[PDB]
């Protein structure tokens with residue numbers, strides 16, 4: 001295939017978060033990471049709900065604040081809108097400006113163990129919120145309040161809006177939901193037992209996962225494929241091979257049919273989903289096991305968090321831009 005060149009691929013930045021001095025350090029590594037839509041921010045969460053933002057490729061520390069009571073557990077997910085950042089915990093949803101100025105706070109009784117959120121049919125004005133529970137909630141982002149509760153038989157681990165709401169259950173199944181009614185349009189059996197990551201563009205769903213969930217005596221086993229679904233034609237595609245075992249995946253923002261696939265050793269494949277033999281390979285050599293991954297809006301910045309509490313940014317040594 002092709003091996004990527006070092007003139008286009010180098011470690012641009014690294015930060016320890018939470019670092020040994022941090023109060024949440026004892027609770028573990030980063031719980032989630034996400035590039036902002038603006039201001040060249042990368043956001044990182046802790047296992048106790050601290051949020052930190054970091055500027056540019058060198059990840060200069062910017063803002064930092066806790067978004068829910070420590071006892072609520074890990075920061076679950078970020079979402080970004082013009083006015084600020086939405087913060088998801090298991091028992092609440094918090095919104096504040098990027099500077100940390102509070103905007104609203106929702107602590108609803110049906111918020112018992114939330115795990116994921118996504119936008120819906122109303123742009124950035126409305127989000128859907130779900131988790132390992134039998135209820136989902138719809139929230140007006142503008143007014144900062146719950147608008148409706150929805151029952152659900154399937155519990156969810158990932159949510160993302162593209163053409164529809166792509167909803168990974170906690171059983172390796174993907175439900176595709178109508179963005180307005182939230183009813184299940186189609187169910188896609190992506191992996192055997194669990195989904196480890198999901199992303200989606202208007203044309204594709206891509207997932208990583210495996211056939212054996214982690215147990216008390218056995219470690220989790222990831223599949224040697226990225227699974228692919230056609231949103232346009234609403235039908236599954238042939239699995240894209242990934243020998244290093246696919247742990248995380250992101251659709252490339254500016255290459256329509258291309259996905260960025262990462263294994264736990266930090267090995268990355270940039271692969272055309274329609275032509276798998278065409279794929280660039282590159283390595284990042286993280287200190288620990290990679291747990292989370294994201295790509296910036298421009299596609300120029302790649303971020304990876306490991307279980308040694310490091311978060312790295314990779315990209316071209318030339319001038320880079322997270323958001324354009």
Ligand SMILES: [Cl-]
Pocket residue numbers: 016017018019020021022
């Ligand atoms: Cl720190």
